[PDB]
């Protein structure tokens, strides 16, 4: 799992992008997981405007046509493009 | 009173979607009122489409709701 | 809405490529549109019309999702 | 409709899954719309198929590539 708890919101977004895209060129050009876990924390408000990890990650996933899904509790199963 | 939505692109849709029901839950539990927020996403696109966008963010996030009349969601705080 | 009809091949599959990769990067980071619309043209018979099939031969071999909607007009989905 | 045109089996065939789902407890809980068109497209069609007919989902054909699943 790609772990993003308790990271500043914009830290842990640029890890994502960045992530995402090398395992989906991983995912294209070898085998392995047509996927990437990510565990964001429960929280699901912002605090003073600013997205907690959880509503920062999945507003950027929905933004940006990912299909996902709940693993358990914090914790999400990205599909890759 | 109403959130609206339509015509938003997704992205700064969640996000007025995001702060506002913090914003609204911080007042609803500090001094009462309504206990919901109305928020309107279309008026009747594929991926583009705000509805889905905004249902997708309320249940992954565990906010219930429910769609009163087409394109208006009323969400509990 | 990017316009590839009547163009040469070649020309018409370095548009769609450039026009891809920005696109893509725009989306990849910004706040814009979730595909491309790609007219490639209308093509009673004379002969072969190059462009749909060549552009539709680019889109499979670099596994982009699309579909023909409107007729002569291709929705590519952003990344 | 839900789109998974272009979408390997595997992938198209857990979506429509997990949207069903979601779907048909809609309906259940709340009656309304009562079905949900499924867009197959153009491999995936036949699983499609498969997956509906073994779990009793009524469907008909609005047009190729486009089917009507009631919830």
Same mark, same amino acid.
């Given at each position: ?6 990271? %500043? ?5 640029? %890890? ?15 085998? $392995? ?7 964001? $924390?429960? $929280? ?29 509790? $914090? ?7």
């Amino acid at each position: 799992s790609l772990d993003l708890h308790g990271l %500043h919101v914009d830290e842990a977004l640029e %890890h994502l992008m960045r992530v995402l895209e090398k395992k989906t060129e991983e995912f294209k050009q070898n085998g $392995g997981k047509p996927y990437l876990s990510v565990i964001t $924390g429960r $929280g699901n408000h912002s605090q003073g405007g600013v997205a907690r990890i959880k509503p920062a990650v999945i507003k950027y996933l929905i933004s940006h046509s990912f299909r996902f899904s709940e693993i358990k509790p $914090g914790c999400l199963k990205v599909m890759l493009k």
